[PDB]
Design an enzyme around this catalytic site. Structure first.
Site, PDB file in Angstrom:
ATOM      1  N   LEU A  15      50.146  50.338  20.595  1.00 39.81           N
ATOM      2  CA  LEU A  15      50.701  51.369  21.468  1.00 39.81           C
ATOM      3  C   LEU A  15      50.790  50.843  22.896  1.00 39.81           C
ATOM      4  O   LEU A  15      51.671  51.256  23.658  1.00 39.81           O
ATOM      5  CB  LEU A  15      49.786  52.601  21.449  1.00 39.81           C
ATOM      6  CG  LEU A  15      49.618  53.278  20.098  1.00 39.81           C
ATOM      7  CD1 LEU A  15      48.537  54.352  20.170  1.00 39.81           C
ATOM      8  CD2 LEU A  15      50.959  53.850  19.638  1.00 39.81           C
ATOM      9  N   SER A  17      48.420  47.760  25.768  1.00 44.50           N
ATOM     10  CA  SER A  17      47.604  46.574  25.905  1.00 44.50           C
ATOM     11  C   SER A  17      47.349  46.313  27.388  1.00 44.50           C
ATOM     12  O   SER A  17      48.000  46.880  28.245  1.00 44.50           O
ATOM     13  CB  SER A  17      48.210  45.351  25.235  1.00 44.50           C
ATOM     14  OG  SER A  17      49.414  44.915  25.865  1.00 44.50           O
ATOM     15  N   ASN A  19      44.184  43.838  30.077  1.00 46.07           N
ATOM     16  CA  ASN A  19      43.194  42.774  30.165  1.00 46.07           C
ATOM     17  C   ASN A  19      42.081  43.042  29.153  1.00 46.07           C
ATOM     18  O   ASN A  19      41.524  42.102  28.588  1.00 46.07           O
ATOM     19  CB  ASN A  19      42.623  42.575  31.578  1.00 46.07           C
ATOM     20  CG  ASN A  19      41.633  41.419  31.653  1.00 46.07           C
ATOM     21  OD1 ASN A  19      41.999  40.270  31.412  1.00 46.07           O
ATOM     22  ND2 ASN A  19      40.375  41.701  31.960  1.00 46.07           N
ATOM     23  N   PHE A  20      41.755  44.322  28.927  1.00 45.52           N
ATOM     24  CA  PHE A  20      40.715  44.679  27.968  1.00 45.52           C
ATOM     25  C   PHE A  20      41.099  44.297  26.540  1.00 45.52           C
ATOM     26  O   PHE A  20      40.209  44.095  25.718  1.00 45.52           O
ATOM     27  CB  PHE A  20      40.427  46.185  27.967  1.00 45.52           C
ATOM     28  CG  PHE A  20      41.624  47.022  27.598  1.00 45.52           C
ATOM     29  CD1 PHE A  20      42.560  47.384  28.555  1.00 45.52           C
ATOM     30  CD2 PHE A  20      41.829  47.420  26.279  1.00 45.52           C
ATOM     31  CE1 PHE A  20      43.677  48.130  28.215  1.00 45.52           C
ATOM     32  CE2 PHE A  20      42.960  48.149  25.933  1.00 45.52           C
ATOM     33  CZ  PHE A  20      43.877  48.513  26.899  1.00 45.52           C
ATOM     34  N   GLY A  21      42.405  44.291  26.207  1.00 44.50           N
ATOM     35  CA  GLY A  21      42.813  44.178  24.814  1.00 44.50           C
ATOM     36  C   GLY A  21      43.939  45.139  24.456  1.00 44.50           C
ATOM     37  O   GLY A  21      44.957  45.143  25.137  1.00 44.50           O
ATOM     38  N   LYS A  40      41.066  52.171  21.287  1.00 48.58           N
ATOM     39  CA  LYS A  40      41.052  51.212  22.376  1.00 48.58           C
ATOM     40  C   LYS A  40      40.150  50.067  21.929  1.00 48.58           C
ATOM     41  O   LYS A  40      38.957  50.284  21.712  1.00 48.58           O
ATOM     42  CB  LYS A  40      40.596  51.897  23.672  1.00 48.58           C
ATOM     43  CG  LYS A  40      40.643  50.995  24.912  1.00 48.58           C
ATOM     44  CD  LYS A  40      40.380  51.639  26.195  1.00 48.58           C
ATOM     45  CE  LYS A  40      40.360  50.679  27.352  1.00 48.58           C
ATOM     46  NZ  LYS A  40      40.504  51.423  28.602  1.00 48.58           N
ATOM     47  N   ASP A 127      41.863  57.757  38.993  1.00 46.60           N
ATOM     48  CA  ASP A 127      43.083  57.075  38.571  1.00 46.60           C
ATOM     49  C   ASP A 127      44.073  58.103  38.053  1.00 46.60           C
ATOM     50  O   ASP A 127      44.737  57.890  37.038  1.00 46.60           O
ATOM     51  CB  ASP A 127      42.801  55.987  37.511  1.00 46.60           C
ATOM     52  CG  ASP A 127      43.867  54.900  37.415  1.00 46.60           C
ATOM     53  OD1 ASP A 127      44.747  54.877  38.285  1.00 46.60           O
ATOM     54  OD2 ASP A 127      43.806  54.147  36.446  1.00 46.60           O
TER      55      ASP A 127
HETATM   56  C1  LIG Z   1      53.006  57.106  21.303  1.00 47.32           C
HETATM   57  O1  LIG Z   1      52.727  56.162  22.358  1.00 47.32           O
HETATM   58  C2  LIG Z   1      51.500  56.152  23.000  1.00 47.32           C
HETATM   59  C3  LIG Z   1      50.444  57.051  22.690  1.00 47.32           C
HETATM   60  C4  LIG Z   1      49.201  56.966  23.333  1.00 47.32           C
HETATM   61  N1  LIG Z   1      48.313  57.924  22.952  1.00 47.32           N
HETATM   62  C5  LIG Z   1      47.018  58.005  23.320  1.00 47.32           C
HETATM   63  N2  LIG Z   1      46.310  59.070  22.805  1.00 47.32           N
HETATM   64  C6  LIG Z   1      44.958  59.225  23.199  1.00 47.32           C
HETATM   65  C7  LIG Z   1      44.418  58.231  24.047  1.00 47.32           C
HETATM   66  C8  LIG Z   1      45.167  57.156  24.571  1.00 47.32           C
HETATM   67  C9  LIG Z   1      44.652  56.172  25.444  1.00 47.32           C
HETATM   68  C10 LIG Z   1      45.224  54.977  25.901  1.00 47.32           C
HETATM   69  C11 LIG Z   1      44.297  54.399  26.789  1.00 47.32           C
HETATM   70  C12 LIG Z   1      44.382  53.213  27.488  1.00 47.32           C
HETATM   71  O2  LIG Z   1      43.394  52.512  27.741  1.00 47.32           O
HETATM   72  N3  LIG Z   1      45.618  52.816  27.881  1.00 47.32           N
HETATM   73  C13 LIG Z   1      45.900  51.507  28.571  1.00 47.32           C
HETATM   74  C14 LIG Z   1      47.159  50.904  27.885  1.00 47.32           C
HETATM   75  C15 LIG Z   1      46.185  51.706  30.085  1.00 47.32           C
HETATM   76  N4  LIG Z   1      44.974  52.251  30.815  1.00 47.32           N
HETATM   77  C16 LIG Z   1      45.153  52.233  32.306  1.00 47.32           C
HETATM   78  C17 LIG Z   1      43.756  51.689  32.477  1.00 47.32           C
HETATM   79  C18 LIG Z   1      43.744  51.476  30.932  1.00 47.32           C
HETATM   80  N5  LIG Z   1      43.202  55.215  26.813  1.00 47.32           N
HETATM   81  C19 LIG Z   1      41.935  55.022  27.580  1.00 47.32           C
HETATM   82  N6  LIG Z   1      43.467  56.297  26.046  1.00 47.32           N
HETATM   83  N7  LIG Z   1      46.462  57.087  24.137  1.00 47.32           N
HETATM   84  C20 LIG Z   1      49.080  56.009  24.332  1.00 47.32           C
HETATM   85  C21 LIG Z   1      50.129  55.109  24.669  1.00 47.32           C
HETATM   86  O3  LIG Z   1      49.879  54.146  25.658  1.00 47.32           O
HETATM   87  C22 LIG Z   1      51.034  53.382  26.153  1.00 47.32           C
HETATM   88  C23 LIG Z   1      51.326  55.186  23.976  1.00 47.32           C
END
Ligand SMILES: COc1cc(Nc2nccc(-c3cc(C(=O)N[C@@H](C)CN4CCC4)n(C)n3)n2)cc(OC)c1
Length: 262
Positions: A15, A17, A19-21, A40, A127
């Protein structure tokens, strides 16, 4: 809080990515049903940060905040959350310029209710931005991404840092102080982003240019089609002096009142 890896099935696709992964969709076997999850996953510093993030999410219980199911210590460390199927609000609106004003007000009101809860619970998000609001449906938003978030001590009203500058209040930049009122400033930028259909704030400007603009008392203008009352609320969130800026109780009430007569 610790989940069984054998009960988790991941998809191959990611979905997102960083630095964490990666973040991947999966399914977690419950008593009878399976629950769709966002996972995550650390490609691993990084550990403690993921653990602190889960520690925050573990303490929150509110319909407009992403719920944590648990942590899984498997081939990698994994933070398993309920899935927000439609993804980030900024990207959604960039792809769906049809969404009505009333629908945007509904979603930003839902964020304000989450944040009112976060402020009552004495956590600062740090944030808050449209990329960190996720959509369950076109009518249901949740706050995500608690990586920079801090539980305030019982006798302090801010966190002293020791940066997404376009979303930060002047006291964050000038004094490194982060409160629930700093998050209100962020919420005003988020509102501007939402009514701008996921445009970037302060287009083309360096952080230092944004700080100078704000110090001259200048603020971003009203997005096309944004109601006057909603722009006025943005400008109130961008109250320079933190002491005089509204908290989320006042912000949520304004949105509530406007929504339930629009
Ligand atoms: C259908 O497409 C998507 C659905 C979802 N859904 C969805 N649902 C429930 C939880 C999360 C979710 C994602 C993250 C996360 O770490 N994201 C990173 C890439 C950027 N952050 C900025 C600092 C880290 N966390 C902490 N929670 N995501 C997400 C999509 O992220 C692009 C895309």
């Amino acid at each position: 809080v610790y989940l069984d890896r054998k009960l988790l099935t991941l998809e191959d696709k990611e979905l997102g990515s960083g630095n964490f992964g990666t973040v991947k969709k999966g399914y977690y076997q419950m008593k009878k049903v399976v629950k769709t999850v966002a996972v995550k996953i650390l490609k691993n510093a990084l550990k403690d940060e993921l653990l602190a993030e889960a520690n925050v999410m573990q303490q929150l219980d509110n319909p407009y905040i992403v719920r944590m199911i648990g942590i899984c210590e498997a081939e990698s460390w994994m933070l398993v959350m309920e899935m927000a199927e439609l993804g980030p609000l900024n990207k959604y609106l960039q792809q769906n310029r049809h969404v009505k004003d009333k629908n945007i007000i509904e979603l930003v009101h839902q964020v304000s209710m989450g944040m009112k809860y976060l402020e009552e619970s004495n956590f600062v998000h740090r944030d808050l931005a449209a990329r960190n609001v996720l959509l369950v449906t076109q009518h249901y938003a949740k706050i995500s991404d608690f990586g920079l978030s801090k539980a305030l001590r019982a006798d302090e009203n801010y966190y002293k840092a020791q940066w997404p500058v376009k979303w930060y209040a002047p006291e964050c930049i000038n004094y490194y102080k982060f409160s629930s009122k700093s998050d209100v400033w962020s919420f005003g930028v988020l509102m501007w982003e939402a009514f701008s259909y996921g445009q970037k704030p302060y287009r083309g400007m360096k952080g230092s240019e944004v700080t100078a603009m704000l110090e001259k008392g200048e603020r971003m203008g009203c997005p096309a089609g944004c109601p006057r009352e909603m722009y006025d609320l943005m400008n109130l969130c961008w109250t320079y002096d933190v002491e005089n800026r509204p908290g989320f109780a006042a912000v949520e009430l304004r949105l509530r009142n406007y929504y339930y007569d629009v």
